[PDB]
Amino acid sequence: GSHMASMKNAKQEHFELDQEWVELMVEAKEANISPEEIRKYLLLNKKSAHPGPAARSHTVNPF
């Protein structure tokens, strides 16, 4: 088969964000938006990226 380009590393569940979350929070208290919608989503979504392999030895033979 012919060669084709690809990304040097796998995708992760981690993403960049910062200043939207401080900007919404200050106004959401004065406007009385629902925090529960985020906190219940967040309570499930305590996410992390997939780990590396264990790389332990194995064989289809008795001890």
63 binds a copy of itself (CB under 8 A): no
Among the listed residues 49, 54, 55, 60, the single contact to a copy of itself using CB under 8 A: 49
Does residue 25 belong to the site contacting a copy of itself (CB under 8 A)?
yes
**CA angle 56–62–63, rounded 5-degree value:** 70
Q: Binding residue for a copy of itself (CB under 8 A) from 32, 57, 59, 61?
A: 32
DSSP 38-54: HHHHHHH----PPPPP-
Q: Which residues contact 42 (CB under 8 A, 6 or more apart)?
A: none
Q: Please report, as ranges, the residues that interact with a copy of itself according to CB under 8 A.
A: 13-15, 17-18, 20-35, 37-39, 41-42, 45-49
